[PDB]
Design a binder for this molecule. Sequence first.
Ligand code: MG
Ligand code: MG
Lengths: 138, 135, 138, 121, 137, 137
Amino acid sequence: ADNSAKLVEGKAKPMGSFPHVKRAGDFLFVSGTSSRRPDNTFVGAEPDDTGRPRPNIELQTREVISNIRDILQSVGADLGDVVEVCSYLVNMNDFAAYNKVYAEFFDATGPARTTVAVHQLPHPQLVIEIKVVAYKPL
Amino acid sequence: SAKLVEGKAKPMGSFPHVKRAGDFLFVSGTSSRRPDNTFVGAEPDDTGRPRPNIELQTREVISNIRDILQSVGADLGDVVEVCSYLVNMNDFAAYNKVYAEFFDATGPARTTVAVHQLPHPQLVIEIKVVAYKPL
Amino acid sequence: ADNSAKLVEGKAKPMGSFPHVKRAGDFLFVSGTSSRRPDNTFVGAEPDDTGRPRPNIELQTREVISNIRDILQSVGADLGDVVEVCSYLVNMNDFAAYNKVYAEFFDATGPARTTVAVHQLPHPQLVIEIKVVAYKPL
Amino acid sequence: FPHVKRAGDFLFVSGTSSRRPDNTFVGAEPDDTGRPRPNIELQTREVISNIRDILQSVGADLGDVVEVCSYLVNMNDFAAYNKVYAEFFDATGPARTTVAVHQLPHPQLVIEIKVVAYKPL
Amino acid sequence: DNSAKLVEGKAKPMGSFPHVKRAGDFLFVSGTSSRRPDNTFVGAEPDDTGRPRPNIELQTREVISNIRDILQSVGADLGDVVEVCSYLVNMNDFAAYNKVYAEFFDATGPARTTVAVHQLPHPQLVIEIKVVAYKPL
Amino acid sequence: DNSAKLVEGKAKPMGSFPHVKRAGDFLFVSGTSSRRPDNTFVGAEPDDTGRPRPNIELQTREVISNIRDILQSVGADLGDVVEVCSYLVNMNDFAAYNKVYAEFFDATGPARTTVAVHQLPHPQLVIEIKVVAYKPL
Ligand SMILES: [Mg+2]
Ligand SMILES: [Mg+2]
């Protein structure tokens, strides 16, 4: 519909020609979200002295879910409206720490979840990207 | 709207097996893992080394998905999207054979990929589904 | 219901016992789609001089989206009804060319998008498969 | 066939697969759908047999092998590969290292092995 | 002959092969992990839920220590190593692995090649190292 | 004593190791990439968006030229190479890599093994090669 898609001010510009979130009837589809900042630096991938990124799954996961919360808030929803989470790791050795952060945000009572490790995410510094579906009738 | 199914394996994290949203049901990625955290279809050999069996795991995964749906008054006939995550495409033909025991071309859309890893090294398949069932 | 699933005439036969597209209320779920033709050859994987397939992400991505359009058209919908795109690459070095083709078809007023590289797709010649969700009330 | 190169007392054998000179594969029989069914047991046995043939071409044999590097694609294939390996070598034989790689050069392959052998002239 | 050696007090090899094989003046050491004799793993202690928590620093240190023990059992030492091949599973582990490597070797020591493979033979491993050493009898 | 060499003017090794190590009559050359001395990369020019675009042909040619330089610094040349181990990251790069390889080497020259690994030590890389050469003093 006319204003179904939203680019959210203050968030990182999407990697391609697509919005952060798309409404469809009562549903909201949130594009895969990373810890990347608007200046194209990465939360939780601070380079060390040699310039080598040191990815931190705890820091990136917390920032990804925080970013998703901001996106939902821009279209009148919040984390309590999320009904499906798809989480893409790059290494399952990051699972325990990612799971610990996930539990800071989602309770009983929360969305369905699926977690897999993919071969690569779109930037080599990423160790997590999450896409969600949310439900909130207008 | 959210459901923890009894006698199914306790979810890896703070999430239900299934979540209702309006007329829809979202089912979390499901494996052959039993409640006691052993796995159907990953029996250890004599050295203690698990031997994954894609046919056995796939059948148990879909059976488990059926059970989850049934706990909220739905069934496999209500499934509309299947996403399947293998770890090696050489397991495709067996997975494909078991899939056909449960679904046909009047059933759900299906997407199948091999991922780098599933959450337990014994696993060779996990499936998540979307189902449609107005109250 | 009885006519909710559709096998589309003129499209490649699905790899398993499933339809090209499935309606659920106002939504349409489109099965993961490749550049495979109805005759089981592939667009964008021409053999080189030794017979070794040479995958071409530009050509495959264009064919995949063209095919998704065909499937949607067969049930009275179109790319403008798409609301979520999930793209599966095998090599992130293919991302830039994939991204360029995606922009030929969709823009920021269109669907949410998620892109990851998987370990393997169902045929070794493939470098992209895409599944979509569309929204089109009857 | 994969090539062997002598260097002093040593023989370096190119990574060897179950592929034939005519580009067909031992141990990846296609189903009626045309999709290959890679078999680690058949491929491993053929690879080690192929390495034996290459070594015999230059006067050596598997008893002269001193290092084995094995490349799988799927560690779920390990147990069966391991059993075939034991048909040809034992603990008095070569050092061995086994990993799974992201890809081998052909999608039908589930094993490739490179070896170093020692056979002074 | 005496060319192949099974080193006492080390983890039993997972196939029918020795820890180290001599060939003329050379020693080939089989790929070595942090796995202990009792088949537990240094640097992959299970957490609260029983899930292994791999630690590249701890595993890398134990790997090179095991290789040192193996060489010392045949009268060689790390000063004799001439080629190191390191197999990670995740390049995000590189920096910590690299720092541990420097505890044992320097630029007067062996050539080194480091890659991340798809899988090692046990899922808890984040490093395995194969070496070639040179030690004339 | 003089068996290890850090080759002047080449990209600095990523860790505490030399470019090449002698062992008796053999030379072991560390895995080599297209990385320049200033730690930029040949064959991975960024596109408009600043995203690197790896080029297997350009990287492979630079890798072999670098290996030639390293061998020449210790008095050897490509003719002395007896084993080649090549690490790709995607087999769709294989044909082009092989074409460049054949510009330098006879196919019945050195023994060769080519696999695709999960990752190389820098994400811009699509090829790294390690060699063993034979050159008695
Ligand atoms: Mg058309
Ligand atoms: Mg024969």
